[PDB]
Amino acid sequence: QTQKENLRKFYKGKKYKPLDLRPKKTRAIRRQLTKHEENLMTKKMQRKSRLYSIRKFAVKA
Amino acid sequence: AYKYMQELWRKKQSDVMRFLLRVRCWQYRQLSSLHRAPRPTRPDKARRLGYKAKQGYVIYRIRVRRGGRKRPVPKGATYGKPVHHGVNQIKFARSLQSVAEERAGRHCGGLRVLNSYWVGEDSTYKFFEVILIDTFHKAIRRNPDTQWITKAVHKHREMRGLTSAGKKSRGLGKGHKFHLTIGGSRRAAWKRRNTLQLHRYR
Amino acid sequence: RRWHRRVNVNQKRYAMCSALAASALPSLVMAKGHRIEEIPEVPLVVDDKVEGYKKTKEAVLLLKKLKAWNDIKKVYASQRMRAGKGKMRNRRRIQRKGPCIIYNEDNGVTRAFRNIPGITLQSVSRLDLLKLAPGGHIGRFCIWTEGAFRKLDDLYGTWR
Amino acid sequence: VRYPMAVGLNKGHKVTKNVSKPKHSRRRGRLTKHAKFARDLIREVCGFAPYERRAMELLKVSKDKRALKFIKKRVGTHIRAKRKREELSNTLAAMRKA
Amino acid sequence: PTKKSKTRKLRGHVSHGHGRVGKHRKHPGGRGNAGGLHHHRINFDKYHPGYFGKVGMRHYHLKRNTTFCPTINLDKLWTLVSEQTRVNYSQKPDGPAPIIDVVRAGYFKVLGKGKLPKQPVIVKAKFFSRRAEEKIKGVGGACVLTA
Amino acid sequence: SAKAKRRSTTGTGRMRHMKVVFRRFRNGFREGTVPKPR
Amino acid sequence: APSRNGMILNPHFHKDWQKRVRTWFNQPARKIRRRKARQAKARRIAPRPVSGPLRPVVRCPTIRYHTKVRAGRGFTLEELKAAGINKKVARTIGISVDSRRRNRSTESLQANVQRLKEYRTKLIIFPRKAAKPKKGDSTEEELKMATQLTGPVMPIKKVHKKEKARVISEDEKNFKAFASLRMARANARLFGIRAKR
């Protein structure tokens, strides 16, 4: 557990890390869209979500 | 120009298309059964079915043996009642185009089938082109209008009756024509109409 | 199989009226099993102050003043062991019933009469027949609150 | 004197009709000047089908009954046979006018 | 319950109430409604005459909402209004007559079965019978229609 | 054959690398951090 | 099988029905599951009504339900334009909109426009940010008098139509009711055969 901490500090910032140093959550999670790819919002629904977003309202009775 | 292409491909009996469908069907039957095409033979039809010029979109030509289904029984002996003595005039319950896309999406497991279309005909074979998508290419995962196919629920969508060519055989729709599949599939409707709903206060 | 049986809503109310009418006769309550030979009055109506009780010591003292503690001493002497294979199925200890208490506002009445064995508390608006007529027999000794007694004429209504 | 009956020619509850603009989906399948220009161009590039070519050969010999029975056998429904024969007769008459 | 059952009083009797000569077996006369024309003909032709055969035309797409036409009689006609309303206009028959809208009460056609009290009354129904309007005109009142 | 499937189904053996997934799921597959030291 | 006078029974128990039997033992627990979902949803949309957007009032098609009104799905684009509300703005202020429904009459059109007018009067709008209130945002005082409306938004008032007792005129008594209906059925049958004459 000492040589792995040195390797994790060595591959810190590297685009390509060894397979054993990558997060092993499960085979289904590793093939999901990352936070960057799922937050991508196309230029059409960016304008639609800007001026047609549901507002906070209330009804008297 | 795509307007002039979809209207030209409707004159399949004219001298221009009858010659092209004669030379290409000859060329298609000289190659293998599953042969990747470098580009869509019908660019107008591909775009119409969801194809783009991005990286990760591939096209495969599939040659399927056209004709009905012969029941695989030894020496044509279906041991049973004369209702099921038919071996010859038996038709597959799924489209022949749906067989071409299932045959292409299985050989390429790492890709998801999008759609397929008709490119050639013959007396023995039918030729199609299957549009597949590499759901792990960055040009496809970084497009919000294409991330829907990268989900795990679309795994092998062409062999569950989800593509346009295979969804027709399920016989679903809206209206008096399609009462058999009210509830999704015909087996979901059949299961609901046969469950004995034993209420708690009946 | 048909575990559940539904009864007519009018027959559920008829059975409730006949169960409340039996809680007003000295015969049907004493013959039910409750020891009320020293209570001041058979329909035991108490002030609405009892709805504000929040400690069991305030609740046990009232039952000793109204001479209803003898009905609870019967519950202590009845605590025994069930006969048969019912002890292996979370029904080991069995006992007897006590004076039911009908209230109107739950300002602490339910928690003040919790730890007393046999006490069954029920709102005046929602009266369960299974607790007001235990075992199918009528004559449950009910202790009424003044607030519950006023609303009782509005729940079912007079004949007029 | 006269009440709205529930049976007859003037059947139904009496209400004032609110006529508005038709749905835009009902213009589907209407020939535009560009759709006509595109199809009339490919008609001279491609030509006529083998069954349309031998059906116009029956119109010039004034066999419109045998022409319709031939087109009705090819295209199917009788409604599509009249429009196809009229389209071939309009093309055959324009060819003669040239 | 089982304590009130019959099998509780058949313990000890061998055949269990099904005879010794003809023992209780599994379907001795066919399952269901079998033999309705061969060996149960005497039963079907005596208690269910008309069971076999066809009669009438076939209505393919029958929608029960189209043939919906609930009827009401003249005897129960005044049930659609209050009892006080029937008396407040019974004393003053000088022309003010209550309007009974049978359509807004859930019925369509009015039939003249019972007797009608001699009071002027206006009825609104989609359909009237011949004798239904004759008894209303004779008692006094109109029979207006509603679509 | 329900008995033949019951003898060799998932769970009749050890589940070495699967019993760990069951334990890591109840915490959200937490990886990369360490508990607070003394 | 039959013994004496009785019905000819047809119990459809010839399939393997025992493998498809749904028992309603989770029915009471499903009420708690549905109710806790309404309470959880209510807190998520706390200032907004819990029943949902404003539903219109429509008529039932068949003659069996000819006279009954019913809450439809959404308001027609013609009913929104008659009240000044835009198509896509109505989705933001909780007004249901559907583009398939049409208005074949004026009585149904004005019934929904007046239903849509009084809603915007009872509709309280919170500004997008409390720092700067915009034009369409409601005043600062009535924002304090806001609450989550429980139950359906503006439930349909099935007003009972009662006609005043009128004097039966002589023209009204001379109306042959049975003859009018009996003639209306004969004209509709002989209408086509008379057009050829």
Place this chain on the structure above:
RNA sequence: CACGACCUCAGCUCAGACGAGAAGACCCGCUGAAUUUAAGCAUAUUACUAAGCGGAGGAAAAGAAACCAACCGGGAUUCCCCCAGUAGCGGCGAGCGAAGAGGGAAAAGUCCAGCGCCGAAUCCCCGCCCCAGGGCGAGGGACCUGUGGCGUACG
């Protein structure tokens, strides 16, 4: 290929990724019987079931009308009650058998191709600079056999 471009097609233990198997109660696509019933039996029934094959998810499938209706008209899908053992199918024998309306649970709608304006305004890879989020490179490509923006039957 004398020297290049392209098209089409190959090779690698080429740089980086992906597919396989398991499980399979529920779910989706095919395939598919006979015991049994008809007091025999061949159509029918059993049954568009068991077994067999392929493919998934925490739900799946379905889904924003080439719908229902024939009315004063309803308005995606799914589920429950009802419609209803009804219309109807059937050696019209045994048997089989939905749907519109209506009352409820939940409700959310939308994107392309095509049409054609915008100097390909678009995308991936590589080498980097700043604090998951933004820029740079007279780097290498993809692409005019069409990327991106506006826009889809409600115009």
Place this chain on the structure above:
RNA sequence: UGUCGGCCCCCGCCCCGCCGGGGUGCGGUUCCUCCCGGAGUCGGGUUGUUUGGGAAUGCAGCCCAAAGCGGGUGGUAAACU
């Protein structure tokens, strides 16, 4: 056990607030002009299967093979409206 009791160590959620990096205005227009769509597909014949769907309810094979005031449906085959 009862007390939504008390305390401690992790972590999550919506809204509000200012600071910091990227977003670009939207509607009304009985006003003008332009554009407006998915072929071996629909449909027809035939065959097998399926359905309560019955002179076809769905699906599929082979053959024929479209139109653009067009096309589909309107539970009886067929022509006109």
Place this chain on the structure above:
RNA sequence: UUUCCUCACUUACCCGGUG
């Protein structure tokens, strides 16, 4: 523009031979 039959053309299709 045509149907029947016959003879020809080779590029569809089919068979054989070869490193």
